[PDB]
Design a protein around this ligand. Structure first.
Ligand SMILES: O=C(N[C@H]1c2ccccc2C[C@H]1O)[C@H](OCc1cccc(F)c1)[C@H](O)[C@@H](O)[C@@H](OCc1cccc(F)c1)C(=O)N[C@H]1c2ccccc2C[C@H]1O
Lengths: 99, 99
């Protein structure tokens, strides 16, 4: 699908059997989701954004479906204002910027 | 062109007669550049991202050239860690997300 940017590029993702809305964010290196429960052990990570840094929990090899496309990768969980699908997963679904 | 997301989507922009490197950010509603001098009057604004909010100066009707494409829009100036080309300008150059 081709997504224009007149509005936020929000899509439905499925993770842990639940549907959530997330932003396709080319400006995000990684994928960070709002506080939730994920399986396995996590490692600590610090990510910096426009307003500073936040501590998140890093879970690896997590199954996540984005707009119907299945991806398996690293997902960060922390106090993010919105669910963000970053480049690590955008590349898995073959997402590109075009103009 | 078609930009892959294996690396950050950085492009050269021309603003106020200056050449700068900026990130094509679909997750950014607005465009914010690091501290610099721009003409006209400005209004203060607070923008929030990961980490919190930062105070920026809002300039309107600013002309910017993104990869050769001329676009006009509001440009925010402030303590952003990286130059960001947001949706308000990405739409003007016909940039879309595709997968
Ligand atoms: O922090 C970033 N990447 C980091 C990141 C993100 C997730 C995981 C890892 C990493 C590392 C970095 O790539 C990105 O910023 C560039 C950036 C790039 C590299 C290093 C940096 F410091 C900063 C960031 O994900 C933006 O894509 C965007 O995030 C989603 C969002 C949406 C709505 C409300 C929110 F509050 C947050 C965002 O902050 N948007 C806000 C914005 C920006 C400019 C002007 C106005 C407004 C308002 C709002 O849209």
């Amino acid at each position: 699908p081709q997504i224009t940017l007149w509005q936020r590029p929000l899509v439905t993702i499925k993770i842990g059997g639940q549907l959530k809305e997330a932003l396709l964010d080319t400006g995000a290196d990684d994928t960070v989701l709002e506080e939730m429960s994920l399986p396995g052990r996590w490692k600590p990570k610090m990510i910096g954004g426009i307003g500073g840094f936040i501590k998140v929990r890093q879970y690896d090899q997590i199954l996540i479906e984005i707009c119907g496309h299945k991806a398996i990768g690293t997902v960060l969980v922390g106090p993010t204002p919105v669910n963000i699908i970053g480049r690590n997963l955008l590349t898995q679904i073959g997402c590109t910027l075009n103009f």
